[PDB]
């Protein structure tokens, strides 16, 4: 406080109000079914359909995280790429809650 607050003229950071919804954790592969689409986009769309009229966006995205993490696993004849998992990654520099039904 003192020198660093109660500014006469208000500014906001240039990176404020961005949200990144990443399909996977930093450094990791992300997975896609050739017929049904990617795990992440499938789950994102299904959770938006079910909850966009009911939940705040971060809470919708937390259910996407759980759906991808818990329900999906890779399948491959190559053992290297078989039985692999994925956790999506929410990066929020938002400053307020986001409700689509608003």
């Amino acid at each position: 406080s003192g020198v660093d607050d109660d500014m006469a003229c208000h500014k906001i950071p240039v990176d404020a109000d961005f949200l990144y919804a990443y399909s996977t954790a930093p450094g990791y592969y992300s997975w896609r079914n050739s017929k049904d689409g990617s795990w992440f986009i499938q789950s994102l769309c299904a959770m938006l359909k079910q909850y966009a009229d009911k939940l705040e966006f971060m809470h919708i995205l937390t259910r996407v995280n759980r759906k991808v993490a818990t329900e999906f696993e890779s399948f491959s004849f190559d053992a290297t790429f078989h039985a692999k998992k994925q956790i999506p990654c929410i990066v929020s520099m938002l400053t307020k809650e986001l409700y689509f039904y608003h």
């Binding site: 949200l19 954790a25 896609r32 689409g37 990617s38 986009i41 938002l94 986001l98 689509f100």
Partner: protein
């Protein structure tokens, strides 16, 4: 104000870059199933009242010019902005059909000081792409 104002005349743009097919010179294999994702997204964001614009198989250069042009529109009547990137990727990088683009180049166009008609408004980047080559074997 704990919530973003979402009752502007328009919810805003939803730009979907759907990259399925990649130049031979990159050695990147076709992204089968991405069209199913693109269609799901179009319908989902249409029901949220977004103006959806789908683009297919864009070069790194076309991605950059598209996002530049979109950032230079007047977004004054729009509540928000959504961009969905569907492609190959690595950490901090999304692939055009002909090679890598730095995500920062894309997102910087929409910074608070560079897209003034979106200052104070939520800018959402939804990214289906790899972020490296680590493998999660899970537990339990």
């Amino acid at each position: 104000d704990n919530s973003y104002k979402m009752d502007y005349p328009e919810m805003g743009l939803c730009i979907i870059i759907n990259n399925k097919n990649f130049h031979k010179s990159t050695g990147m294999t076709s992204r089968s199933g991405t069209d199913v994702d693109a269609a799901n997204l179009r319908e989902t964001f249409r029901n949220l009242k977004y103006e959806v614009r789908n683009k297919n198989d864009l070069t790194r250069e076309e991605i950059v010019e598209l996002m530049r042009d979109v950032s230079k529109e007047d977004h004054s009547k729009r509540s928000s902005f959504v961009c969905v990137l569907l492609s190959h990727g690595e950490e901090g990088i999304i692939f055009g059909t002909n090679g890598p683009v730095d995500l920062k180049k894309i997102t910087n166009f929409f910074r608070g000081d560079r897209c003034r008609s979106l200052t104070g408004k939520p800018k959402l980047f939804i990214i289906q792409a790899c972020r490296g080559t680590e493998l999660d074997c899970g537990i339990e």
